[PDB]
């Protein structure tokens, strides 16, 4: 939920010198236009939807003997020894 | 600064008051909070106003 909301972002589209702009160079309290906020808002909704469709991305699970059954599922090559002995 | 003082400690007061543990029934199960106040008396004898 709290991943794309940067701490510069506001619904009332405003700008600050310390954050949300490239730092200290413009050093005045500016706001966006309503017609500039209309693009950043729909862009953020689009990127949320991008992250949602990446969440709804079907993984290619290999098939051991069946679907929905741990048949010939190959797990990883096993864990090392804590002093060597890679496998 | 040269002031003839004396220090003693008056008795301490605890105000222990009670309230319900649950939100509903089980009135027979309370929980009690106490507030301590510790005093210190700091007499200062024979000094100028300033």
């Amino acid at each position: 939920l709290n991943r794309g909301q940067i701490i510069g972002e506001g619904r009332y589209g405003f700008l600050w010198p310390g954050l949300n702009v490239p730092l200290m160079k413009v050093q005045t309290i500016a706001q966006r236009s309503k017609e500039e906020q209309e693009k950043v808002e729909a862009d953020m909704i689009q990127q949320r939807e991008e992250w949602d469709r990446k969440k709804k991305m079907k993984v290619k699970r290999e098939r051991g003997w069946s679907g929905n059954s741990w048949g010939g599922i190959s797990l990883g090559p096993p864990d090392p020894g804590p002093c060597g002995e890679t496998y | 600064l040269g002031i003839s003082i004396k220090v003693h400690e008056p008795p301490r007061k605890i105000e222990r008051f009670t309230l319900l543990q649950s939100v509903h029934i089980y009135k027979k199960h309370r929980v009690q909070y106490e507030m301590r106040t510790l005093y210190r008396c700091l007499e200062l004898e024979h000094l100028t106003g300033s």
């Binding site: 600050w16 310390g18 | 543990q21």
Partner: protein
């Protein structure tokens, strides 16, 4: 089974700090009161306003310094003066910090008619007391 400030022991991957590893039967024993004001002593007035004011600061500070508080806060009061001890992770840029410092310093002072002084302390990670 009382459930007040207990974090419930579940699995060995729960890292907790010192203040929340302890149940509320330890507050004078192994902990300390995080807010420090004179309102609770007896007899003395004006208790309620300062507790509501203090619960406002903890909701305010956990939002405006987002995702970077390690612990809860400490509020100290010395008369017409109140200071805030806060431990903050070293994740955000110090420029971004120093903006939100003075913004808080003047906004909360103009809100509560009192010269506040928020004094932070950096930490790399959240300090772990008990791996439950």
């Amino acid at each position: 089974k009382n459930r007040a400030a207990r974090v419930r022991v579940s699995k060995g991957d729960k890292p907790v700090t010192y203040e929340e590893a302890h149940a509320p039967h330890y507050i004078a024993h192994r902990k300390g009161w995080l807010s420090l004001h004179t309102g609770n002593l007896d007899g003395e007035d004006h208790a309620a306003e300062r507790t509501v004011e203090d619960v406002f600061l903890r909701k305010f500070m956990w939002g405006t310094f987002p995702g970077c508080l390690a612990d809860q806060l400490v509020l100290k009061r010395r008369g017409n003066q109140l200071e805030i001890c806060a431990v903050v992770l070293r994740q955000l840029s110090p420029h971004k910090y120093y903006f939100l410092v003075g913004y808080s310093e003047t906004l909360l002072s103009y809100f509560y008619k009192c010269p506040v002084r928020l004094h932070l302390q950096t930490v790399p990670s959240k300090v772990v007391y008990k791996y439950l």
